[PDB]
């Protein structure tokens, strides 16, 4: 798809069995979901952004699906205040910026 | 490290 | 331009006569920019991000230039890690997300 700018791109997710809304956020280095249960083992993160740091469990080899599309890659799952898709899974997409 | 730009307007 | 993701979407944008790099965020709603001088008078806002909360500085109508294309809006001031363009300015130069 064309996705505008106008609002939010925010979009269906689905990750570990469950159905989410995320951002698509080409600002982000990664991809960051609120608290879920997640299959294989984890090592705590942190990792930072506007107003400084927050910490995450580190999952690695996690399948999601983003607007239909499925990808495989690393999920940090904590206390974000919105979930976002990271450039580690729009680049398995295909997802560009064009203007 | 800071790589995660998510912003929000208030 | 086509923009692809397996680095930072980082741009050269220019504001006050100088030269800045800046990352193109789809995350972001607003434009953000580290500390600098613009003329005119400026208004509060808090922006929320990843770690938490920071208070900018609001100067409308700046004149910028994103990757040489033309733009004439909003932009914040303040402790942000990284200059970020947001869909403010994204949308008036054009930018959509594809796959």
Same mark, same amino acid.
């Given at each position: ?6 609002? @939010?791109? /925010? ?27 997640? *299959?294989? @083992?984890?090592? *705590? ?35 974000? *205040?919105? !979930?976002?898709?990271?450039? !580690?899974? /729009? ?6 910026? !064009?203007? | @490290?800071?790589? !995660?730009?998510?912003?929000?307007? *208030?």
């Amino acid at each position: 798809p064309q996705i505008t700018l106008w609002k @939010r791109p /925010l979009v269906t997710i689905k990750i570990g069995g469950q159905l989410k809304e995320a951002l698509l956020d080409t600002g982000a280095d990664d991809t960051v979901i609120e608290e879920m249960s997640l *299959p294989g @083992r984890w090592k *705590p993160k942190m990792i930072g952004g506007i107003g400084g740091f927050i910490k995450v469990r580190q999952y690695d080899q996690i399948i999601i699906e983003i607007a239909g599309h499925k990808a495989i890659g690393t999920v940090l799952v904590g206390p974000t *205040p919105v !979930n976002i898709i990271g450039r !580690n899974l /729009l680049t398995q997409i295909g997802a560009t910026l !064009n203007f | @490290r800071p790589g !995660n730009x998510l912003q929000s307007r *208030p």
